[PDB]
Design a binder for this molecule. Structure first.
Ligand SMILES: CCCCCCCCCCCCCCCCCC(=O)OC[C@H](COP(=O)(O)OCCN)OC(=O)CCCCCCCCCCCCCCCCC
Ligand SMILES: CCCCCCCCCCCCCCCCCC(=O)OC[C@H](COP(=O)(O)OCCN)OC(=O)CCCCCCCCCCCCCCCCC
Ligand SMILES: CCCCCCCCCCCCCCCCCC(=O)OC[C@H](COP(=O)(O)OCCN)OC(=O)CCCCCCCCCCCCCCCCC
Lengths: 97, 49, 48
């Protein structure tokens, strides 16, 4: 928190460079990757929004899904056994005779 | 306040550097154990007949 | 004392390097400059 309040704002003031409203996109293997990634993520966001809308309209379906989720959680909580600490190989063996 | 250090970048750098130096110095002297717990005392008495 | 000396060797120069570093850093914080502190630092010989 403190670092974000003091050190990073100074770093941004000092180290960030002013934006330029000019036709300076250079097509490059290193560069075009980012444009393609941005387009893909932009449409993926639309897909997510559509899924959210269908979730909101379907009250019963969302309710039952969440109920099943909590039920599966509680069912699996029992299945794991419980111990204080794990057993670690420590590279030594003692033998009793 | 953010404004104070926005105008005094060298000051903010110096504070960051001092923190890092203190931490590096600390790391060169810390104890290293597997667990935070420290075992409670034991006293043993030995006699031979 | 001989043993003490052998243990205490190389502490003073290390210790005085740390102090000079921190003095530089504090002077830089005061003047807000990386080059100004050195004028102030150059004065050490004169007193000694
Ligand atoms: C400047 C900011 C940093 C502060 C430190 C500045 C130098 C301090 C010089 C000094 O008076 O140190 C005292 C020190 C004590 O002596 P001792 O414990 O025997 O360890 C030395 C081995 O050692 C001494 O008595 C001798 C000190 C020698 C003088 C060194 C400084 C001048 C460097 C340019 C020549
Ligand atoms: C391993 C190293 C130790 C690590 C400790 C943990 C990190 C502590 C936090 C970092 C401390 C950084 C210290 C930097 C010193 C800064 C000196 C300075 O020049 O700041 C000036 C500033 C005032 O600035 P301004 O009002 O703008 O005026 C400028 C001119 N117009 O002044 C100010 O705004 C106030 C700044 C604070 C002033 C502190 C005063 C020093 C008091 C020290 C007493 C404690 C000593 C403990 C000794 C222990 C003994 C065993
Ligand atoms: C510690 C960081 C030192 C550093 O950042 O060096 C920069 C500076 C040379 O560049 P200058 O243009 O003077 O920068 C002043 C701030 N804009 O550095 C200098 O002017 C002097 C050299 C500083 C050396 C740092 C202490 C060793």
């Amino acid at each position: 928190l403190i670092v974000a309040l003091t050190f990073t704002p100074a770093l941004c003031a000092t180290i960030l460079k002013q934006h330029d409203p000019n036709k300076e996109p250079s097509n490059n293997i290193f560069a075009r990757f980012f444009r393609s990634f941005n387009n893909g993520f932009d449409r993926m966001s639309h897909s997510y929004q559509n899924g959210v809308s269908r979730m909101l309209k379907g009250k019963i379906f969302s309710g039952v899904l969440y109920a099943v989720v909590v039920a599966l959680l509680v069912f699996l909580f029992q299945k794991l056994p419980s111990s204080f600490l794990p057993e670690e190989d420590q590279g030594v063996v003692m033998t009793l005779v | 306040m953010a404004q104070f250090f926005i105008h005094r970048p060298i000051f903010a750098w110096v504070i960051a550097l001092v923190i890092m130096l203190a931490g590096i110095l600390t790391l060169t002297k810390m104890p290293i154990a597997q667990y935070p717990t420290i075992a409670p005392p034991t006293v043993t008495i030995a006699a031979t007949y | 004392l001989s043993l003490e000396e052998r243990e205490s060797g190389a502490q003073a120069p290390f210790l005085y390097a740390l102090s000079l570093l921190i003095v530089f850093l504090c002077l830089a914080a005061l003047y807000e400059s990386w080059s100004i502190p050195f004028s102030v630092l150059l004065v050490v010989p004169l007193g000694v």
